[PDB]
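Objective 1.3, modelling of assemblies. Example input:
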Amino acid sequence: GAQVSSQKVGAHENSNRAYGGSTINYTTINYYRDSASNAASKQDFSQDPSKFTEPIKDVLIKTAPMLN
Amino acid sequence: GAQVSSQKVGAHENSNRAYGGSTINYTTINYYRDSASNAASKQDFSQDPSKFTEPIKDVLIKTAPMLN
Amino acid sequence: QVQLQESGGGSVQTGGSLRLSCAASEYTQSSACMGWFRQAPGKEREGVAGISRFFGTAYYADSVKGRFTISQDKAKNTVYLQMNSLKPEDTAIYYCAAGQGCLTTIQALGGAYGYNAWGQGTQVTVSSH
Amino acid sequence: ACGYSDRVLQLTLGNSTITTQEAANSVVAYGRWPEYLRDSEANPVDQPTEPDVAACRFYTLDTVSWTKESRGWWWKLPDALRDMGLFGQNMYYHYLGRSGYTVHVQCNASKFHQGALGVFAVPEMCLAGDSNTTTMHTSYQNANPGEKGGTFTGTFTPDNNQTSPARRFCPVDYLLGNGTLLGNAFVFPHQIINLRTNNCATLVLPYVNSLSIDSMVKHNNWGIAILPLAPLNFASESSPEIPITLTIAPMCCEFNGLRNITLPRLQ
Amino acid sequence: ACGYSDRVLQLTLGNSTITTQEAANSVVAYGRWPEYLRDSEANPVDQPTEPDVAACRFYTLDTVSWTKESRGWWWKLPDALRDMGLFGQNMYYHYLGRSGYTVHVQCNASKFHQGALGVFAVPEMCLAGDSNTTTMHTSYQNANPGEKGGTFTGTFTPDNNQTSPARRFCPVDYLLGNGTLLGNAFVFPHQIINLRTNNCATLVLPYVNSLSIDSMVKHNNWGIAILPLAPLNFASESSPEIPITLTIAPMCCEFNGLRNITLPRLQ
Amino acid sequence: AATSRDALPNTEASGPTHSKEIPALTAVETGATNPLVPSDTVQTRHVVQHRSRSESSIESFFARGACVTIMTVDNPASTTNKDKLFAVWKITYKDTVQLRRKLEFFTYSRFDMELTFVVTANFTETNNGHALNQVYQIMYVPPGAPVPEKWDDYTWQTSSNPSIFYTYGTAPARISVPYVGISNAYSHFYDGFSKVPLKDQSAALGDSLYGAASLNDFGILAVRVVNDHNPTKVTSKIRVYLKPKHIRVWCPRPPRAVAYYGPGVDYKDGTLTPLSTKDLTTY
Ligand SMILES: CCCCCCCCCCCCCCCC(=O)O
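Predicted structure (tokens):
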């Protein structure tokens, strides 16, 4: 029941027959029954700030006049 | 998500039905999400010293005259 | 910045005690040796006193050693400057000087070079009225 | 077949051409040719300034003299080109910039003259200062002498004027002014103007830094060190002299963050 | 549909953007957009200098004041940009060169202010001199005032100082300083900043000469004439004032024959 | 495709020769080192080489931790006059020498740093009183964050500053940090300054240190003994060891030949004598 995930490699070791290049992955294993016990996956998602930036009813075309 | 690598055998145990001969490999498992946490693979690469030794624009033929 | 706000402009006679203080409450890479600069309108701006943020690295200008001392409050956050036995030659506008990353006052020891936040300026006159 | 030789060369950058007959081939630092900033490596967003032939051409500095008692000579890039036509102008008006250079030092003598000159290109040629009281104490003015460059000395002289220090470099020759034996200097891309064989040294240097582009006004990426490896002698005279001249050319010159003129205090 | 209008405009050249809400469209002189020098039309052999964004961006001159007694104002190109950042530098260092420009004059008032300003671009705006003794007698210094430009007058004044003449222009307004009625001025590409309607005038001028490229230092290809067609009045006051500002941008800027710095005597 | 631990090329048999091919003669002025092998100058045999440059790869050369600093903290009595000692130390490789010079073989480098924390503790006052096992919190204060002023101020709460809680008597503390440079690589030598002194500015307003920049400012490490005032004082030292793993380097420089003098390249009088005495005609 292992959870193997990828690592976005930053600094690279002069290696590509072990480290460096060829996709470096990590393993994770949940030991507890309760989700509250698990570690943070950190594999999150982004969104569009619109709901805060453009909370306007009518579509905003940046090139057009705001007021028309 | 284990990483099994080889060992360049130096001294050999009077063994070849376990150790000594038949390719001895090792295992490695990444436990952390960040690449910065990983151990050094040590499986590196060499290059040609030329960029330091022969940084000359024109090809150096060792048997020919340097100056021609 | 840090906050640098100084006062203490008392025109005392030649041979009296005066205290100068500069606020350094906020804790950025905090004023290391700190710094005190005087500008004599005859000359220019020059470095004078300075004690390291944590350590006892206090540099003293040749002209002010012994008479002028630097000390501060590692809590109440303000930098004191005890200037006693005042000559008329010390009549200039003083300024406090934040030298951030302590190494700024470890490498060069004295301020001047590693100093990014500049003080306001207090006029001190030491005369024969 | 056609008589083509590595001693006889001619290089052309813009409306300027260099020609020689006593070359010792040509060096391309670390095997990398100068290049423009790649999209994958870029960072400032604004559209860059590429002056081309305008800035990218040969520029001749002020000639110095080689004699028996000279200890060496130095220059920094871009610094040594700060006041050279367009390039300099383009340097002073933009916050950032990058460039490569083809450095060509000239110094011919006679088949009766002798001596060897080490021309070393040292990326990040951070020289040593003159005080034993304060470190990293050399001022901007003294650090950057520009086109005239500076010299090395055979004896360290610590400044003892604590009232108004000199704040300059005191680069000892044998320690290549950096605290490291001149002997290893050969680790840097280099050539040797050994009078017998050659009259010139040509090195092509790409842009080298810890980042794609930097403020050339604040930071020098390459240093030019020229030290006599062998002494200068002629026949049997006591004080011979032979001039040395450096012509430098930026390559793949580009700049960003255009703004108002920078007027630094040089003195 | 989206509210797009000819009054509301924004133009961008380099790291500079102009924006307006009271425009009267935009004029492109003779229907020709500025362009680079074509191979079929070229003449100097050397590889040209194309500064791009470096020189080709908006440049704002010194603001002048419009009042009831102003007779008009004038500027020449490139002249009026001679000391503008890179372009000027690039002008002073090269023998030849060509360029187009997008001239944008600014002058807004109130819906309670009135007046009309004629902005005329006159190729080869050779103005008239002040002497009745000698013709074509205006000196270089007085001819080229640069960024500050010059003005027109309502009364001709002949210089009678025969000892040390003034040697300047005396451009009569109604004769558009050239001996031709201002009324026909409309033959030149133009616009009118009539306070009611518009706050600005935008004209795009291509490079115009009798030849592909010319010495911009010696010769001005375009002139900028701004004269109040209608007088400036506000409410019922006696001396109203409204500022006028010109921002100019070279376009397709190119130069050849790079050499040493030109240091002209401007005074 | 040549790895670090692969065998170097074998030396092959070569007999006598006499012709127009010139291996021995070249010209160093060109800046190129003649790439000769033994067979070019002497008659050799066929030899199957077995040795490899496994141990000299950049990785391997730096595959070790080095004491970078020694920090000092204590826990005195409550009745004390002088305040309890807390140590603050700016993160640099240049307080020590050994590690520095290795790093200095190159101009630029990229690496992920692994830090270890060996902690020592001792009694100082010749008494017979007692102390209870100590816990030490090593907080990392990055540039900008509030640096402690008291052993007991609000900073030690650590809501976003990385902090280590080390119990004395257990495995030394070890963390990892990625390539944190503001540049694309860490610069070991900077040929410049931070500020540009301008003409219409006061010299004072325009000065900066030569070779000093933010490229190297990583903040400080703050440490204290978490334990509250103890009747008999206890002294302690945290020795930090830095290992640059997953390392990459650029531009070789000659190694420091004269003892260091400050974080720069400067050297002092009378240290400028690295080589001893040796006559030209003796072995
Ligand atoms: C609590 C753990 C601390 C985490 C933060 C560590 C701060 C990063 C500092 C890394 C740079 C060290 C300086 C040496 C690099 C160099 O040789 O230039």
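The domain at 1-267 of chain E is CATH 2.60.120.20 (Jelly Rolls).
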